[PDB]
Design a protein around this nucleic acid. Structure first.
Lengths: 56, 366, 229, 927, 366
DNA sequence: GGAGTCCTTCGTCCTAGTACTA
DNA sequence: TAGTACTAGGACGAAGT
């Protein structure tokens, strides 16, 4: 069950992915604050693996 | 026009005839009280457009007929306001009503009697006596089940059925209900009258708790009731109260007992942590026990552990706490016995000393 | 046992076939047994086969790349179909789901039939419309009506609404059942077939003449009169 | 005779607006396709489509039979709501019927609809035939209850006062209690000896229209398809079942069917239509004829003195006016319209005496010098040869369209004066049923059927804004309609049904679009419908129908523009006393001002009426019109025809000597047409020119001229060919070459299709000139008025300021102290906002503000404002706008500090106002 | 944390802290209770941002200190429902408070103490004590003259003015004024300060039926009251208010007394036929007598005549009778005295037994 | 017989007017 | 003897992703 919280952070960090198709609104700076510490590590890598792949 | 009456003789009639009053009465003279001296008595009249309350008071000094209708709550309070044994003398001088009390003087706005409709005298069908006390418990025991606002207008009121040698009354929301049966000592022909909630409010208020016996006459679509000195009259709603025997539960095979005060207490406590509107409480019964809980929107949880005598089959059932508390507040008695059928029927609820009455809510499945 | 869903996906087509070119991504799999919340979800996700629709993003803000590597509809088609088989399907936004369900079943190309053949198809909004005609019958509307918390829950739809919608469903069916009165619900199709002395009141010779003159006027002003044909 | 023994006797068109369907003509075409000789239409509490009913009956050889259903109150059932279906036998009944209807509406009503008292059957008695009310009558309700004493009391009345004029309505359509009612009614029919008659209570053509009708009702009611509380009072079997279908349906009840034959015999109502019912009282002490002639000569006197203040030129130019006077006089008198004009001309004079500037339309009334002489028109028709025989043609003894409208600004005043003059009940206004747009019909179908707000609105917002848009048109104009048709099964079901719903009347005309007069009570001839208080009566016939019934029309045009002028004039003539600039009469303006033309040349013509289009402003720029006739042309120019025939560029070139002036064509020209074509530089533009040149070139009558122009509007091959022959020999008669004449006649034909009504163009162009004069001559001052006109529109407001700015016209932000109702200019203070310029605010609050400002001086602060005016008038919402705007700025210094003390100020007002109202003093003192 | 408390000690505090809580207060945290165990005691609190109630109570059974925030309204109502002498089991563990009582079981919405607005600590300026029963006099003698909503914020609350050894208070709305004072028996500094409406409601609330000493300490801009173990805190406001000696009529020359009860009953009566919004009447006064008459828009007319001690000529004047009936309820006497100027100036009144609450109320312009 | 014309829907949020219960 | 709940009426936005 506890990876089910952790893998929902993989889901939230995907918000920053759609920056790479800004045809309608996506906010990069919001996720910095909403996401607490127990997932910052997984979230920060998630940003980068997401952002390049939502382009293609 | 003349009469003389004492404060103490006016006070209680005035409060009682002041009952029908309120609701920004549309036909203005309905917000006024009619003074009529007729035959050997002073008669007062107030109507709410659906019912009438009449008072008969002793006129011992010289008097003469003549009548008018003065503004009601304000007028009641004036009379209620006078001291013990006060000189009340009123006189109709045509258009104006002059009211005095000793050296004080009162001259009122006056509308003539003939603007007030006088409602038709009607014919009796069935007629009877019993103590007021019995009737107080009877009404009180069912009052709460009547809706205040329902679109099924016929439920905004009370079924009176007289049958065999029993006086038998019943009321409902369309959710919940109480029916009660009392033996009256003489033969009654079969009858039904459905009385609007306003009517029964008025009836309740006219029980001042005297040992003055209660005698009442009921027509087909009208009603007459005498308490001690006072006489009540109303018309009813024309029809469509269904057969109450239809909703009665079908031989509940499960029995459940718990001490009434205790029981009542736990319910009261539990009520506070339910859904504000719907009062959702949960009941699991088992051998010797019941499990009480409610969950409410604020994530709050209550539970009460309790003294439950229980023989029957195990089941789950929940229903609106307010409605059941209303029966528990009416039942200031020794014990409640509950009689169950299944988790999806209407349930029967009883004082364990009187099967005279039955109380019922159907459950919601939450 | 009664099973429902409102499903969040690779956005929508707003016109015509609202489903065209889209496939399902998300599984929160509600088990509600005897109107009680088991929460017995099988929780793994599916293949988008595409990029996010801008509308869908603004509603929920989800992005493609999380849900791509997770196995496709075909891998858990049967796993999930066994999870739903032999059940009451009372569902909100029925046109969307049923469309997808049946359609996806055929898209497996194992000839697996449309869901409405082995499951009872019921729209929840139909019942909501029945209960509250001309009131808003939405999730958030009735949420606020039945006082459930979707103010501390930002997601619109499914990973939350599963739970909530259960509570809503319960409320609607658990609103309160009714006191069996004797009531007769209008729309019974009958005809009398009788004969017995009745009076016929005829027009006078003068009345006939007024009519014959009136028809003159019809015919002469119009160029024909079908009574006089 | 050969076949018919039957007509349906209870039938409603869609024009009832609570019930009925489609149109009456299609209903009639089906009755005829069913081989019927006659048919009763009994629309609900009206016969609004009686005009169309007569038109259809007359046309198809069907006898129109007259009737209706009503809302009944006998005192025996109280206000239990019932029908009576009531039919007229003859002229007598017709009158009574019409009066009853009008009396129900005169009484007032709510959502239940207009109700009648049973005892209005006292008055409205003779010549009528009546029913049981069907299943849901006073009789039906009492029969369903089964109280025989109550029944006896009710029937007795109708057996007494309507002997042999009472038949029983029967309905077996598979609905609740039809058996029970019918069964009890056939027992009553034996028992009272009253005659029985059968109907199918028909509302529609085909059984599949059931759904549509159901929704029709539900549209009014505002409920959804599956709602159990929603009334479902009708069944699909209520359609036009055929002769034989009905014969066997009631082969158990013979008298019911035979009583249709009987009733059909009795019902023969005569209303004359298409020729006039006289609406005229004699206005002064004189003959009708003579009063006209007199007031014509006296109206002429004003115009003469105005036009020709040089007495030498008056005499030289006079003959043409006397000749035109008498020419027109002769035709007006011979055709019998002088009553009309007397009313109107007295009315027009009266509206000038009062503060009523003249409503914008004249139609093509500038063709009449008489109209002009009587001050019915505004500028000089004989200066520009403007033509009467368009306005009334003698050889067309048909419609005399007088084509007048009047100004909204003074509406209630006019209606009132004409009620004071004729009698309130001799007169009425007209239905303006809000036109069922493609938008509306879709919208309403969709929500009723329980599609979401979004679903159905996604369909309707694709449909172009056209008023005449239909589903047939929608499919061809927008490819997304075929798309959603093929891509949604429930949309297919929707559109199949919505094709039957397309363009049905939505509900009652909210408020009129015109007025009429009779010689006696208007109700002697036409019926009414009235507003939610039973007031402001409107005729049951619409524009087309009401005049085809032979009665007098005056249309609406609320041009906020006359109000502008009015208001601008008042405020300019305040600038009289301020700087001795004399009272200015718009009719009395000079027509040659170059400031005006300079500013026009700069294309600064926004909010000049009909120069609102972008293309039209582009056209002004290119056109460079330097005389009044070019300006009259502008409306006729900015249109599909002229732009798509190169006509704009032709005229532009031909105007400045870029292309040669010819009379009319480069090849096909004739100098005797120069008087006609001078002002347009040889360009064939007007309907007037058409008719001028037929008369002038080829010896036509003026009425023969009108005949050709009409024929070219229709574009008929026959019409041309005949007149084309007389046109040839008419030219030859005056010596003009045949080939030249006929080849110009081909050019005529081309431009006749586009050929514009000069008099109609000019009447409206007049107004543009007026907006232009006022602008240019004192445009800055008018600018106020411009902005007044567009208060509610934010877009225009903002546009207009940008127009002020370009002009050099320093626009100032507001001040509550100086502000009037609407825009003002102090002498030095170039411009101030109107108080109405505040964004959302309604009228009562704004009057309050200024009323307080009148009694007091300028309000010293926030505080002093609130104190002077009661809380009724001061809402917080009001005041929130005030802060937001900065209306206070000058007094209340801070942006933020004022918003804070707003609550305080409100409370002080409640506290100080209310105590003073109660009458009790406080004890604070010293601020 | 954990605690255990004895129903009867804690029930009364619960009612004290429970009363003020508005139907809906502004900030949700304000709907919950402050529960802090510090040392050997729990302090329970509810606030409206301008007032605060604290009860400190001895825990006889095992505990550990801590902090939480739990739902107030419903909690008190539950505790009304509890059995006599109830033993309660409550415990902090992280982000849940577990609430059991006897065999009943509850699970709560729980916020941290720190999310509740922790109100301000301040330094005492002046301290003093008085009996509860004297304060109730002071309050109840003055309370009703406060407006319901006056945005002259210095009207909505009660003025306390301390100079020399006397503490003097007053309330008013422009239309009534009432003062009440008793000495404190200690030489004080000067602090004068007015309490908010809702603050004063709660102060009333905590005047339980006991002769136990009531102590209050004022700061520069806040105030605290100890009555034994019942504890009050409220911040104050700058509160520029007028000098009540400019509001006092100096010497109204003509004097008047009348019997309170007779007065009151007569007023009661006459009052009913004044328009209820204006309360309009005319008082005509003569030697040894008063004549009372009214009429309203409804065109009801009034007259009461009575025994008054008065020396001088006639006077014409009219008032809000609610205002005076409120003083007459408070006025615990046989004789009251009016000392009058005229219809456009104040009328001063003083109880022939009070000599502490004098009253000046504005009349009408007729 | 040709051509030109009118307004909009419903539910929920905020504040004020008149009723009811502890 | 005081405080809040319900209805009225306009203002602003709309079922789900």
């Amino acid at each position: 069950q506890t990876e089910m919280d952790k893998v929902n952070v993989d889901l939230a960090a995907a918000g920053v992915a759609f920056k790479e198709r800004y045809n309608m609104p996506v906010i990069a700076e919001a996720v910095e604050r909403e996401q607490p510490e127990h997932l910052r590590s997984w979230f920060r890598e998630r940003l980068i693996a997401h952002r390049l792949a939502s382009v293609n | 026009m003349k009469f003389t009456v004492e404060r103490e003789h006016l006070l209680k009639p005035l409060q009682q005839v002041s009952g029908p009053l309120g609701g920004r009465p549309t036909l203005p003279i309905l917000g006024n009280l009619l003074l009529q001296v007729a035959d050997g008595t002073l008669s007062l009249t107030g109507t709410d457009l659906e019912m009438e309350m009449v008072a008969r008071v002793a006129l011992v000094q010289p008097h003469e007929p003549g009548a008018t209708t003065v503004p009601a709550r304000k007028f009641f309070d004036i009379c209620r306001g006078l001291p013990e044994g006060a000189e009340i003398a009123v006189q109709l001088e045509g258009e104006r009503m002059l009211v005095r009390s000793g050296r004080s003087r009162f001259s009122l706005s006056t509308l003539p009697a003939a603007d007030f409709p006088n409602l038709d005298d009607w014919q009796s069908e069935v007629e009877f006596t019993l103590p007021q006390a019995t009737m107080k418990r009877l009404i009180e025991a069912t009052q709460f089940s009547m809706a205040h606002q329902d679109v099924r207008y016929y439920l905004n009121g009370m079924l009176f059925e007289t049958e065999g040698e029993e006086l038998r009354t019943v009321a409902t929301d369309g959710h919940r209900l109480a029916v009660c049966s009392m033996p009256i000592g003489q033969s009654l022909p079969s009858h039904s009258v459905i009385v609007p909630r306003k009517g029964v409010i008025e009836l309740m208020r006219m029980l001042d708790g005297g040992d003055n016996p209660l005698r009442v006459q009921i027509g087909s679509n009208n009603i007459r009731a005498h308490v001690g000195d006072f006489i009540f009259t109303s018309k009813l709603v024309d029809g469509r109260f269904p057969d109450y025997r239809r909703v009665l539960p079908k031989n509940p095979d499960k029995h459940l007992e718990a001490g009434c005060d205790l029981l009542k207490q736990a319910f009261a406590r539990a009520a506070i942590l339910s859904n504000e509107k719907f009062r959702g409480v949960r009941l699991y019964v088992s051998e010797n026990q019941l499990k009480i809980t409610a969950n409410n929107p604020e994530q709050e949880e209550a539970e009460e552990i309790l003294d439950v005598t229980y023989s029957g089959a195990e089941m789950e059932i929940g229903f609106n706490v307010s409605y059941v508390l209303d029966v528990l507040n009416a039942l200031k008695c020794e014990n409640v016995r509950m009689m169950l059928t299944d988790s999806v029927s209407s349930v029967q609820i009883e004082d364990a000393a009187s099967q005279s009455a039955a109380y019922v809510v159907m459950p919601m499945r939450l | 046992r009664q099973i429902v869903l409102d499903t969040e996906t690779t956005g929508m087509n707003q016109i015509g076939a609202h489903y065209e070119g889209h496939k399902i991504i998300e599984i929160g799999a509600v088990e509600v047994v005897n109107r009680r919340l088991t929460g017995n979800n099988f929780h793994v996700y599916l293949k988008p086969d595409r990029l996010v629709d801008p509308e869908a993003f603004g509603v929920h803000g989800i992005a493609d790349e999380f849900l791509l590597d997770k196995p496709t509809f075909a891998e858990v088609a049967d796993e999930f179909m066994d999870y739903i088989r032999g059940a009451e399907l009372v569902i909100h936004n029925a046109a969307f789901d049923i469309g997808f369900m049946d359609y996806e079943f055929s898209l497996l190309k194992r000839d697996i039939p449309k869901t409405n053949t082995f499951c009872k198809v019921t729209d929840s909004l139909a019942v909501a419309r029945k209960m509250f005609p001309g009131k808003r019958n939405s999730l958030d509307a009735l949420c606020a009506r039945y006082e459930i918390d979707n103010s501390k829950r930002t997601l619109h739809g499914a990973l939350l609404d599963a739970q909530i919608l259960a509570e809503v469903y319960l409320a609607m069916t658990g609103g309160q059942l009714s006191l069996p009165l004797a009531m007769e619900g209008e729309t019974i199709q009958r005809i009398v077939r009788q004969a017995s002395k009745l009076r016929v009141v005829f027009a006078t010779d003068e009345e006939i003449a007024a009519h014959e003159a009136r028809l003159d006027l019809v015919q002469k002003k119009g160029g024909s009169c079908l009574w006089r044909a | 005779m050969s076949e018919p023994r039957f007509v349906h006797l209870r039938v409603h068109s869609d024009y009832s607006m609570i019930d009925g369907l489609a149109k009456t003509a299609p209903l009639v075409k089906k009755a005829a396709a069913l081989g019927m000789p006659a048919l009763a239409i009994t629309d609900f509490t009206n016969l609004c489509g009686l005009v169309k009913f007569y038109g259809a009956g007359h046309g198809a050889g069907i006898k129109p039979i007259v009737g209706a259903d009503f809302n009944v109150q006998c005192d025996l059932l109280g206000d239990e709501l019932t029908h009576l279906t009531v039919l007229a036998a003859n002229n007598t009944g017709y009158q009574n019927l019409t009066l009853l209807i009008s009396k129900a509406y005169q009484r007032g009503y709510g959502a239940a609809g207009p109700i009648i008292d049973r005892d209005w059957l006292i008055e409205l008695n003779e010549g009528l035939i009546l029913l049981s009310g069907g299943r849901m009558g006073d009789v039906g309700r009492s029969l369903l209850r089964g109280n025989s004493a109550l029944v006896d009391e009710c029937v007795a009345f109708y057996e007494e006062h309507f002997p042999d004029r009472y038949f029983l309505e029967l309905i077996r359509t598979g609905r609740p209690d039809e058996e029970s009612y019918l069964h009890a009614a056939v027992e009553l029919a034996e028992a009272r000896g009253l005659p029985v008659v059968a109907t199918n209570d028909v509302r529609f053509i085909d059984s599949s229209d059931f759904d549509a009708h159901e929704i029709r009702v539900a549209i009014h009611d505002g409920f959804t398809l599956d709602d159990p509380k929603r009334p479902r009072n009708y069944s699909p079997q209520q359609y036009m079942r055929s002769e034989e279908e009905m014969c066997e349906l009631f082969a158990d009840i013979p008298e019911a069917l035979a009583n249709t034959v009987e009733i059909a015999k009795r019902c023969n109502v005569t209303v004359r239509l298409g020729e006039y019912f006289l609406p005229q009282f004699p206005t002064g002490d004189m003959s009708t004829e003579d009063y006209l002639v007199k007031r014509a000569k006296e109206g002429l006197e004003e115009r003469l003195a105005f036009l020709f203040p040089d007495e030498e030129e008056r005499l030289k130019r006079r003959p043409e006016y006397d000749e035109r006077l008498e020419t027109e006089l002769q035709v007006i008198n011979q055709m019998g319209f002088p009553g009309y004009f007397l009313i109107v001309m007295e009315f027009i004079q009266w509206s000038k005496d009062n503060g009523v500037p003249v409503g914008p339309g004249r139609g093509s009334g500038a063709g009449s010098l008489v109209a002009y002489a009587l001050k019915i028109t505004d500028l000089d028709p004989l200066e520009f040869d403007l033509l009467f025989e368009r306005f009334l043609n003698p050889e067309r003894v048909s419609m005399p369209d007088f084509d007048v409208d009047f100004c909204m600004e003074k509406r209630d005043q006019v209606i009132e004066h004409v009620a004071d003059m004729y009698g309130r009940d001799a007169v009425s206004q007209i239905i303006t049923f809000g036109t069922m747009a493609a938008k509306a019909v879709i919208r309403d179908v969709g929500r009723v059927l329980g599609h979401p707000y979004g679903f159905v609105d996604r369909i309707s917002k694709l449909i172009p804004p056209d008023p005449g848009m239909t589903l047939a048109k929608a499919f061809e104009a927008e490819p997304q309609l075929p798309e959603i048709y093929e891509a949604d099964e429930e949309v297919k079901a929707l559109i199949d049904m919505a094709r039957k719903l397309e363009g049905v009347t939505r509900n009652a005309g909210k408020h009129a679009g015109g007025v009429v007069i009779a010689p006696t009570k208007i109700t002697d001839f036409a019926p009414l419908y009235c507003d939610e208080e039973g007031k402001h009566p409107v005729t049951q016939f619409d524009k087309s129908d009401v005049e085809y019934a032979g009665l007098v029309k005056f249309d609406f045009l609320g041009l906020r523009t006359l109000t502008i002028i009015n208001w601008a004039l008042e405020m300019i003539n305040k600038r009289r006393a301020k700087n001795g600039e004399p009272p200015l009469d718009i009719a009395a303006i000079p027509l040659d001002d170059k400031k005006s033309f300079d500013m026009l040349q700069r294309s600064e013509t926004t909010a000049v009426f009909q120069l609102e289009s972008r293309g039209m402003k582009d056209l002004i720029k290119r056109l460079q019109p330097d005389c009044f006739e070019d300006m009259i042309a502008l409306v006729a120019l900015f249109r599909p025809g002229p732009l798509q025939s190169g006509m704009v560029d032709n005229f532009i070139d031909r105007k400045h000597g870029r292309e040669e002036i010819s009379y009319p064509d480069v090849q096909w020209q004739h100098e005797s047409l120069k008087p006609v074509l001078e002002p347009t530089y040889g360009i064939i533009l007007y309907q007037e020119q058409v008719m001028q040149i037929a008369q002038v070139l080829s010896g036509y009558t003026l009425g023969g001229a009108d005949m050709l122009r009409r024929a070219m509007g229709k574009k008929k091959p026959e019409e041309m060919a005949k007149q084309r022959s007389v046109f040839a020999e008419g030219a030859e008669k005056n010596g003009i070459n045949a080939e030249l004449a006929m080849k110009i006649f081909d050019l005529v034909e081309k431009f006749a299709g586009y050929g514009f009504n000069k008099s109609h163009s000019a009447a409206y162009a007049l107004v543009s000139y007026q907006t232009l004069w006022l602008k240019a001559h004192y445009p800055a001052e008018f600018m106020a008025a411009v902005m007044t006109a567009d208060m509610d529109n934010t877009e225009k407001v903002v546009g207009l300021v940008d127009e002020c700015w370009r002009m050099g016209l320093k626009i100032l932000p507001p001040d509550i102290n100086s502000g009037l109702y609407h825009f003002h200019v102090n002498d030095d203070g170039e411009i101030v906002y109107g108080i109405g310029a505040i964004k959302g605010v309604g009228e009562g609050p704004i009057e309050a503000i200024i009323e307080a400002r009148n009694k007091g001086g300028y309000f010293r602060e926030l505080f002093d404002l609130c104190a002077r005016t009661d809380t009724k008038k001061l809402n917080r919402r009001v005041l929130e706008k005030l802060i937001m705007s900065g209306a206070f700025d000058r007094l209340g210094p801070h942006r933020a500090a004022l918003m804070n003390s707003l609550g305080d100020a409100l409370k002080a007002a409640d506290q100080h106002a209310k105590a003073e109202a109660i009458g009790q003093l406080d004890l604070f003192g010293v601020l």
